[PDB]
Amino acid sequence: LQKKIEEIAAKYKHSVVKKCCYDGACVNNDETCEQRAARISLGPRCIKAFTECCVVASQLRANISHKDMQLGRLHMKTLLPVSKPEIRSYFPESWLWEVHLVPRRKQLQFALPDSLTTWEIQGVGISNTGICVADTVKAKVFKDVFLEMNIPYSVVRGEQIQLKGTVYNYRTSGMQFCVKMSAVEGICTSESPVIKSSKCVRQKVEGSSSHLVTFTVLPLEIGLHNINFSLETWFGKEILVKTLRVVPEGVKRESYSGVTLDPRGIYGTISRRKEFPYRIPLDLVPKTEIKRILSVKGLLVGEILSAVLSQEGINILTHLPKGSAEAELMSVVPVFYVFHYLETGNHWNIFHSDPLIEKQKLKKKLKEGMLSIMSYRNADYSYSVWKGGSASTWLTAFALRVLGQVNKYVEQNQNSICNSLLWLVENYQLDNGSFKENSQYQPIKLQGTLPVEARENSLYLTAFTVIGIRKAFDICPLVKIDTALIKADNFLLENTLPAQSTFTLAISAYALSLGDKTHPQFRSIVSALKREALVKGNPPIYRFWKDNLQHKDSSVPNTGTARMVETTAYALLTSLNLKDINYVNPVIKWLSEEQRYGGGFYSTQDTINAIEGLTEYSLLVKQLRLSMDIDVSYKHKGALHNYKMTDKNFLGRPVEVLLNDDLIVSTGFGSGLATVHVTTVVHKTSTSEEVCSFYLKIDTQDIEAKRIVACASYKPSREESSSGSSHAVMDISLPTGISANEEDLKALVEGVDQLFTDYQIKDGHVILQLNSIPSSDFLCVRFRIFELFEVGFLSPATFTVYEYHRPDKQCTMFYSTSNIKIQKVCEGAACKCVEADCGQMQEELDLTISAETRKQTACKPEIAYAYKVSITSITVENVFVKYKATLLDIYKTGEAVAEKDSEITFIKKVTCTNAELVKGRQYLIMGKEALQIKYNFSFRYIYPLDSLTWIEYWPRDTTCSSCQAFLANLDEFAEDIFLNGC
Amino acid sequence: ESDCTGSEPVDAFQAFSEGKEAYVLVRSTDPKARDCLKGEPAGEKQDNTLPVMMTFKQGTDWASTDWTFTLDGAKVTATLGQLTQNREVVYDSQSHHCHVDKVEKEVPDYEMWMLDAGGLEVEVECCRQKLEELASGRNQMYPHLKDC
Amino acid sequence: EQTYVISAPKIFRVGASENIVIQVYGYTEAFDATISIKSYPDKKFSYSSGHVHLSSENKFQNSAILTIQPKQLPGGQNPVSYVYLEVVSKHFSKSKRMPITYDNGFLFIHTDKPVYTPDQSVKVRVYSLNDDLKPAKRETVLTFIDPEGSEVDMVEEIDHIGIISFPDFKIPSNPRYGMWTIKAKYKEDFSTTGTAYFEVKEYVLPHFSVSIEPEYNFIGYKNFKNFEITIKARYFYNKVVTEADVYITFGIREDLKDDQKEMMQTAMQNTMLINGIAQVTFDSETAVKELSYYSLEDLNNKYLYIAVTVIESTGGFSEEAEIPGIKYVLSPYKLNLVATPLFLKPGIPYPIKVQVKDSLDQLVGGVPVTLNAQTIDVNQETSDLDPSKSVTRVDDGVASFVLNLPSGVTVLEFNVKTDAPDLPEENQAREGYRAIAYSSLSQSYLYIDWTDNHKALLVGEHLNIIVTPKSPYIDKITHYNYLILSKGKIIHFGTREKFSDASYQSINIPVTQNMVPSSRLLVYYIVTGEQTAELVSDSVWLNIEEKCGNQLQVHLSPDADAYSPGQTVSLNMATGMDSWVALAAVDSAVYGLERVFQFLEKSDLGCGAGGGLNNANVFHLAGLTFLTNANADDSQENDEPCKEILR
Amino acid sequence: QCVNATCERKLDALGNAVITKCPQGCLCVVRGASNIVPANGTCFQLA
Numbered sequence A: 001l002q003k004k005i006e007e008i009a010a011k012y013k014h015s016v017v018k019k020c021c022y023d024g025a026c027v028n029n030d031e032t033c034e035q036r037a038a039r040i041s042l043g044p045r046c047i048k049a050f051t052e053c054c055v056v057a058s059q060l061r062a063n064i065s066h067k068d069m070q071l072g073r074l075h076m077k078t079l080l081p082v083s084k085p086e087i088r089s090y091f092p093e094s095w096l097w098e099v100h101l102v103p104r105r106k107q108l109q110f111a112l113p114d115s116l117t118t119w120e121i122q123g124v125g126i127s128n129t130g131i132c133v134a135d136t137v138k139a140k141v142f143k144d145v146f147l148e149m150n151i152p153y154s155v156v157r158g159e160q161i162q163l164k165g166t167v168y169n170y171r172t173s174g175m176q177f178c179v180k181m182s183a184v185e186g187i188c189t190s191e192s193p194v195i196k197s198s199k200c201v202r203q204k205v206e207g208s209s210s211h212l213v214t215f216t217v218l219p220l221e222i223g224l225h226n227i228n229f230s231l232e233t234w235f236g237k238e239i240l241v242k243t244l245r246v247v248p249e250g251v252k253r254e255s256y257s258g259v260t261l262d263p264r265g266i267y268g269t270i271s272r273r274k275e276f277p278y279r280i281p282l283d284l285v286p287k288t289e290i291k292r293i294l295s296v297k298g299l300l301v302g303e304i305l306s307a308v309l310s311q312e313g314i315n316i317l318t319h320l321p322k323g324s325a326e327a328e329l330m331s332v333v334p335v336f337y338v339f340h341y342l343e344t345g346n347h348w349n350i351f352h353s354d355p356l357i358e359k360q361k362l363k364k365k366l367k368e369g370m371l372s373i374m375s376y377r378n379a380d381y382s383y384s385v386w387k388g389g390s391a392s393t394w395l396t397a398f399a400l401r402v403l404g405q406v407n408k409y410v411e412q413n414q415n416s417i418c419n420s421l422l423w424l425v426e427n428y429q430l431d432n433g434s435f436k437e438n439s440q441y442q443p444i445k446l447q448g449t450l451p452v453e454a455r456e457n458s459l460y461l462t463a464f465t466v467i468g469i470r471k472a473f474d475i476c477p478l479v480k481i482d483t484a485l486i487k488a489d490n491f492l493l494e495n496t497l498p499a500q501s502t503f504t505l506a507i508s509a510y511a512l513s514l515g516d517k518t519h520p521q522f523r524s525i526v527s528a529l530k531r532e533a534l535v536k537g538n539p540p541i542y543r544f545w546k547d548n549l550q551h552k553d554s555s556v557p558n559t560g561t562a563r564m565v566e567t568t569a570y571a572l573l574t575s576l577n578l579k580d581i582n583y584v585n586p587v588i589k590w591l592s593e594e595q596r597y598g599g600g601f602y603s604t605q606d607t608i609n610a611i612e613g614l615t616e617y618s619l620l621v622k623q624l625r626l627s628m629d630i631d632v633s634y635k636h637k638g639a640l641h642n643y644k645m646t647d648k649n650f651l652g653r654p655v656e657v658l659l660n661d662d663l664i665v666s667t668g669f670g671s672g673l674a675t676v677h678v679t680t681v682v683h684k685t686s687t688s689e690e691v692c693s694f695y696l697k698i699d700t701q702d703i704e705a706k707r708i709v710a711c712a713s714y715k716p717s718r719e720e721s722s723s724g725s726s727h728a729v730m731d732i733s734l735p736t737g738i739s740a741n742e743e744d745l746k747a748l749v750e751g752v753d754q755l756f757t758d759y760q761i762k763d764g765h766v767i768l769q770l771n772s773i774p775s776s777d778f779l780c781v782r783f784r785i786f787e788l789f790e791v792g793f794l795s796p797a798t799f800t801v802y803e804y805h806r807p808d809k810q811c812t813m814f815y816s817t818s819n820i821k822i823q824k825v826c827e828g829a830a831c832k833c834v835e836a837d838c839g840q841m842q843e844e845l846d847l848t849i850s851a852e853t854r855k856q857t858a859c860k861p862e863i864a865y866a867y868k869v870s871i872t873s874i875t876v877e878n879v880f881v882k883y884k885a886t887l888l889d890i891y892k893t894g895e896a897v898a899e900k901d902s903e904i905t906f907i908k909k910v911t912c913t914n915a916e917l918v919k920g921r922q923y924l925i926m927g928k929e930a931l932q933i934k935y936n937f938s939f940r941y942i943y944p945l946d947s948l949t950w951i952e953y954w955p956r957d958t959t960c961s962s963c964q965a966f967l968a969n970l971d972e973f974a975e976d977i978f979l980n981g982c
Numbered sequence B: 001e002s003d004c005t006g007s008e009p010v011d012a013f014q015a016f017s018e019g020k021e022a023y024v025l026v027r028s029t030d031p032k033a034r035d036c037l038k039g040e041p042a043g044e045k046q047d048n049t050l051p052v053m054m055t056f057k058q059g060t061d062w063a064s065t066d067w068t069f070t071l072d073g074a075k076v077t078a079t080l081g082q083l084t085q086n087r088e089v090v091y092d093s094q095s096h097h098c099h100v101d102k103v104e105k106e107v108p109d110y111e112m113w114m115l116d117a118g119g120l121e122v123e124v125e126c127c128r129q130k131l132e133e134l135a136s137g138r139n140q141m142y143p144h145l146k147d148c
Numbered sequence C: 001e002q003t004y005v006i007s008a009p010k011i012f013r014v015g016a017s018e019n020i021v022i023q024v025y026g027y028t029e030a031f032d033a034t035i036s037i038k039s040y041p042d043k044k045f046s047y048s049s050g051h052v053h054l055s056s057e058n059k060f061q062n063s064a065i066l067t068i069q070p071k072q073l074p075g076g077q078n079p080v081s082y083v084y085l086e087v088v089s090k091h092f093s094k095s096k097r098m099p100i101t102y103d104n105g106f107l108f109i110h111t112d113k114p115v116y117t118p119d120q121s122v123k124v125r126v127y128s129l130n131d132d133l134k135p136a137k138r139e140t141v142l143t144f145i146d147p148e149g150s151e152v153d154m155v156e157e158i159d160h161i162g163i164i165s166f167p168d169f170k171i172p173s174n175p176r177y178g179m180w181t182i183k184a185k186y187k188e189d190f191s192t193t194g195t196a197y198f199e200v201k202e203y204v205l206p207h208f209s210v211s212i213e214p215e216y217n218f219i220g221y222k223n224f225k226n227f228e229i230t231i232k233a234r235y236f237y238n239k240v241v242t243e244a245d246v247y248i249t250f251g252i253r254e255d256l257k258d259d260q261k262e263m264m265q266t267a268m269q270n271t272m273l274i275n276g277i278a279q280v281t282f283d284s285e286t287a288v289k290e291l292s293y294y295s296l297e298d299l300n301n302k303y304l305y306i307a308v309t310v311i312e313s314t315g316g317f318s319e320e321a322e323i324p325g326i327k328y329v330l331s332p333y334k335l336n337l338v339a340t341p342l343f344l345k346p347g348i349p350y351p352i353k354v355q356v357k358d359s360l361d362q363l364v365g366g367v368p369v370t371l372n373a374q375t376i377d378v379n380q381e382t383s384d385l386d387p388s389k390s391v392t393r394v395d396d397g398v399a400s401f402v403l404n405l406p407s408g409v410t411v412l413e414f415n416v417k418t419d420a421p422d423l424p425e426e427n428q429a430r431e432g433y434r435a436i437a438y439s440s441l442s443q444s445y446l447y448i449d450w451t452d453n454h455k456a457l458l459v460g461e462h463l464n465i466i467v468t469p470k471s472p473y474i475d476k477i478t479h480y481n482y483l484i485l486s487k488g489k490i491i492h493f494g495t496r497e498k499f500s501d502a503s504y505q506s507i508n509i510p511v512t513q514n515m516v517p518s519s520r521l522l523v524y525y526i527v528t529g530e531q532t533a534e535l536v537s538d539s540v541w542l543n544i545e546e547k548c549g550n551q552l553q554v555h556l557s558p559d560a561d562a563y564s565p566g567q568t569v570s571l572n573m574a575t576g577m578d579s580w581v582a583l584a585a586v587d588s589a590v591y592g593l594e595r596v597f598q599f600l601e602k603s604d605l606g607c608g609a610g611g612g613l614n615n616a617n618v619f620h621l622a623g624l625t626f627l628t629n630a631n632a633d634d635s636q637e638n639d640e641p642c643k644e645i646l647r
Numbered sequence D: 001q002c003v004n005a006t007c008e009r010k011l012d013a014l015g016n017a018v019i020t021k022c023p024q025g026c027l028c029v030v031r032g033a034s035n036i037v038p039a040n041g042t043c044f045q046l047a
């Protein structure tokens, strides 16, 4: 057994292809050796070494012992790999890093940082007598007995969470203690406050050890709730302040609305008012508020200005994950364009403080951002999409664009840029002038058959590379790469028409716009692009482009996508390079309103090109004086507030819209041009009415020797080939308290047989990225999970996959890691937290209810509605239960009215048992509030079943024995309520 | 440019995208044309009739009135309560992105409608040519340029 | 017979204040002399010059400080390599070709931590001194090179006080992991460079803590058959790991800098971690019978690399640990000479002071040392001396010897060994040495030595040196002459009267702060008459206490063995004079570093403990060039400074 | 013209990495790693 592996290792000890044998021998009980080798893209020798070591390793692993397996991993794991720099401990930031003038004697007092650390203070004196390294003095900040608690990132409302913690006793002698919890209103605990924070049960920690701590809680309210933990000992008392983040059920969905304020109609029609209506979505999670933020910035570039200059973050594309070098460049895009605006237009007086220091700060952030991509550069000055992966023609072109633009304000290394450009034109430019991709990275999915898709992708890549080379040409203006630019421009000129998509047509038009703008074929391409223009209004208020050609699809999209904004952006930049000022104003209005709170758009490419369009346009047109009186108020509610916007302040902070009324943003006679964006955040219970561009399936399994299996497959659009998707993202939300095995995920990306190209775990999400998801068959990520802490009433999680550059091509699915049913009953006490905020059915045929208590509860000013219904259908949707009922007799209506004998929907949290409703039975239901939805073309009302919702069973006949008397008093109340009007 | 002959013969239901899209009034010879007038389907196609919700703006107040359309080929008989209005779609773009209506009265007015989502610019321009031909020098109103 | 002696550093340093000494003899009437640094070889341009007066009031000795201005030298393609040192007077005019270096000053790069994780910010400052160990106040350029050799950032800053604070270097969110290099340099005039290193490692969350504890830090002859190793492991919630699987692999390593190692698949012994502790024993002999080696005579100064993998049994999690290397030690002792020039003076007893240290380079006391020696005279007739034996002094670690050799001896090949009662003959320490006789055509020799070197010289005391010449022409020597050098600059010079009523006479030298941390003393007398004047010289190396010129001291009030988090505390700084002070507070756990006084005496152009094959070699090994009308026969191509010899 | 001249990355008089100058019509590119000193590059046309 040892020799059978010594031969293997000895065979590949100094082999050229050595890693392929290593990760070939790695365990994969889900795929055969040939299936794993089918993904290898490093050549035949790597495939044969991989296949050999895979087969031999699989034969030796038959009927092994754990010692034999581990010893084999010792032989393989040492001789073949090299090393990797990593550290197991974190070291806090140093401090006291200052210089002082010491007049022979100087004392300075401060406060030691909050940490358990042996600090080392070092002084170095400099004077005309030389240097003096003083004796290093030690200062050990140490705590002998202390409590720490592990609070999860988020917790879904209604879940019963076990909060684990530990008390540490480093003293050599054991001791007594007790930890108590601080009761906050929204956090329901099984015990009850004594005096108001829990109880002290005295326990003992043994000397030089620890003791476990557990606190079971159940959050009833959404939001961030403070919880304190007190550790008491015969030597003192410590308070540990903590915060629990409670998240709603269901999926978060985010919609955006944009409005441009032009009070004097300088760039178009006058625009002084706009009304953002309050509309409740269909599947809104009950008892959750519809959030929406309002951002009113000063200029077309004002949103990006606020994004960069306000340092509370911030990424304009937080919904897209990091991992690709494209993300590292996009990190420096906004700072770059802000700097370009401030410097080219000389608008440094916007700062009320010293402008030179602000230009300094932005220059530094620009440089630091520019270093972020250095990791993705290879030795030959090429760039790889994925760190350690193969060099990409595409990403090298993009890096040459960003670097070439940044070089204007922060000079870039000319020799490096030269070597990169030469890497492009010397290797991956064909005779016909087009460029080819080296790696398997597919940034975009295009239409047509395999040959037609090949032509389209060739045109797109050539135009993209041309843009990069043009943007970085002045750094290294070589005749060789200018000749290359001539050949590529010729390819674009001859092969663009006839067009196959408005997208490739637009990017080709912009790439050619960066060169000779007098060539006749370029003018023909510009005409064909103008022919595809869509307009809103006549005379047009808006002008935009759909990425599909008209002759292939005549339908007009109702909402924007990333391809829409990217095509429109390429066309806008092409028109700006042509100085076509009559044509761009509706495009600028459309791109400005399609912008998003934060400054970004849908994906990365559309974002950068749209930012360049808005910024270049803002520098090309006259800067108007800014002076408006902007009033935001609700229609049928009080005025929210108003501010006077001037050039002094116009990047004002956002404002949350809490009230459930329609918003109205208005301004009087004004000078300037402001932007008003509203971001609506809701939480929905379903995803059925959303278009799914992926077949999804996900399960948890028990394994031999719990594991998540998440499979996706691409659904090709019309005229799309079966080759599969482009750059894809598999985002797996983990349930509360479920933790993923990071070793399995490493094993799926680190190898030559990698299934995924990058992975990360962020905020309870397992985010994997991928070059392509197949159309022919399913692709599955498989990784083990374990239970970190106990969770009762576990809320389901989400499984989302989407194209990185087309987030609109997505599919979201709910899943749970727990099989747990049944939910029959809660049995007595240890109960009040689950049944806390939902309804309790009255006692069946209970005659003690005294008809006046049935009227006073109905006439309560808190109780909005109150009437008698008959249930028609039961339904269980995800985490809630819907009851279809018929509205029989109306007894009260405070708010909106519903028609008699119309269909009324009820909803209760599935995790509520004592409100069990039987289909076909009548009930008297009285409660607070409702939801008014617009379904089909008519209204619909949905009523949640919570606490203070009085429900009672109501038989129709009178053969219930003594319930004859029951219905008598019931009909007594029913008769008295409507004849009075309390 | 191109040729503006589109959608022959003219069908009103086809000109209305079979009741799946909303249309906005962009040109009208009616001096009392409502500001920001947008028509959207308010129901399904039952028999030859079709519910149509009409939104518009008076001053700074938004208003909506329900109407019913009776479609007969190219002719449309719109009505609300007792008020009736006879119209005939006299031109419809090739992709049904815009159309030109002719409303009947002593001085028959001509209107131009287009998809609220937008339309192909060449087809929108063709509809504009047709309306300018029919109006024949009369003053045109632009209800969508009223700060909508 | 009249003579003149010009003493200068072996090399001229651009921008440095170079002190040039002139000492003339035989002249009774006063006269002036011009010392000059001019251009080579035309002497058209005068980089600098100074006038010195020589009189009876002056004892016919004077000094002049010259400076080669950096701006007076061309730049780039054909830079200056040599200058002319010239002395002109009524009596003589002599010049010499002197090499120049553009290395001036010191640039110490100080980063707050040596290891960083992503998104952290590197705090970095530079201490910049000139050749005279004073705030350089020169603008400085910092360059950052990543592990792939790419220059990724450069920033220059002017220097006001000698401490240069740079903006913090932000580590990228996803950086290039490995060894980063910082290079400091001056923007103008000079070629001085400073260099620091810092690693960027990726943080990985550990499941538990694994510790390896070897029996000793070195492997001697007693543990060559058995070496105990205790492997402990505990969870980070302060509980011992109950059960785990321990796998240990052993390797042989050349040096700790190189990450190369030779594994031994024979000693892959596996054990069980029970209740937190496991233990194994490594039979070095048997395992190193693999990979050749075989014996303990080999493996000496090589290392034993240890790798351990611990697989906890409950959750199946695995964590690794490693010991980089345990140096195999063949002898518990190492020998080195102290204050014993490897040069013989015929007629003077030759002293040898051996010094014994342990594996930690600590002075071991009470160690007997045996000294053997062979002698070769002018007739090539070899003689084996009788062995001598001393015992290591335990006050200073010294083991002293005094040797009486025949006057005709020329070469002394002496060998020293340790004589420990419990060590085999192989495990003893042995060192060989060869000493060559001072060569003089007039059989004239000089030997200086200052009472004795223990304890080290403290600034403020006095150095009572003994000057013993052995020669003919003894009672016609008028005076003795001396030059005191430190940090590559002649700090003192003078002449003492020779008493006709003794053989030796004590020359007293007050030890000053200019002499910290080391100095060199050159003493010489002039043998005159017919033929040609001869300089008879000797030199000694003076190790002086490392004492700051402006002493810094920091204290924490209150003083306590441990503090509590968030505690308000006062730091007291005290200096001898008004001084700038750069402070830092670093988590000591990063160190698992710098010493300036040793890197500072790289400017000492001298080598060895003193002495020389002849006069010119005595001046050369002291870091000096000289101009003389006397005999100046030196070795060949002797223009660059000496290089300290290693063994 | 100017394509036939040589260019390289050498050390300064004072120990600086420097790129030599191609003639008055070309520009120099040092193929290879950036830390390799000295290492000859090739001269290139301009336009």
Ligand SMILES: *[C@@H]1O[C@H](CO)[C@@H](O[C@@H]2O[C@H](CO)[C@@H](O)[C@H](O)[C@H]2NC(C)=O)[C@H](O)[C@H]1NC(C)=O
Binding pocket: A182, A183, A184, A226, A227, A228, A239, A241
């Ligand atoms: C949790 O502990 C914090 C810190 O002690 C409490 O915050 C303090 O509350 C008191 C009144 O209870 C105030 O007088 C202090 O000003 C507060 N300090 C800070 C920093 O906010 C907090 O009230 C505790 N919460 C609960 C639920 O017990």
